[PDB]
């Protein structure tokens, strides 16, 4: 079973800096990971899929990369509304798994 560990647990970054989040799968992934943003009081929003392509309505500052076991999500210049909880997600055949999550705070 492929499981996801996110690194680090929390980041303290001022707006305008560069945010980098890592996701490590227990083995080489069956499919490239997806990245979701989630805020309290609302549903999670799909940010990145296929590990590098932005979903609809996602600002260009969100970028992704990775392969094998290592994947990363990057925010070039983070706006104040970018501080939230971010999840990586993997799916093998009929099994979806989530990373534990990473919190971005000012």
């Amino acid at each position: 079973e492929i499981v996801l560990t996110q690194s680090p647990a929390t980041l303290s970054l001022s707006p305008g800096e560069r945010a980098t989040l890592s996701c490590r799968a227990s083995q080489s992934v069956s499919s490239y990971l997806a990245w979701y943003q989630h805020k309290p009081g609302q549903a999670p929003r799909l940010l990145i899929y296929g590990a590098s392509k932005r979903a609809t309505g996602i600002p260009s500052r969100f970028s992704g990369s990775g392969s094998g076991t290592d994947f990363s999500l990057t925010i070039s210049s983070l706006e104040p509304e970018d501080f939230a909880v971010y999840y990586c997600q993997h799916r093998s055949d009929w099994r979806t798994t989530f990373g534990q999550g990473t919190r971005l705070e000012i």
């Binding site: 069956s30 499919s31 490239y32 997806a34 979701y36 549903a43 999670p44 929003r45 799909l46 899929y49 296929g50 590990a51 979903a55 609809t56 392969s67 997600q89 993997h90 799916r91 979806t96």
Partner: peptide, 10 residues
């Protein structure tokens, strides 16, 4: 690369 996502949420 294969991919999967949850794009529309309730």
């Amino acid at each position: 690369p294969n991919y999967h996502y949850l794009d529309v949420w309730g």
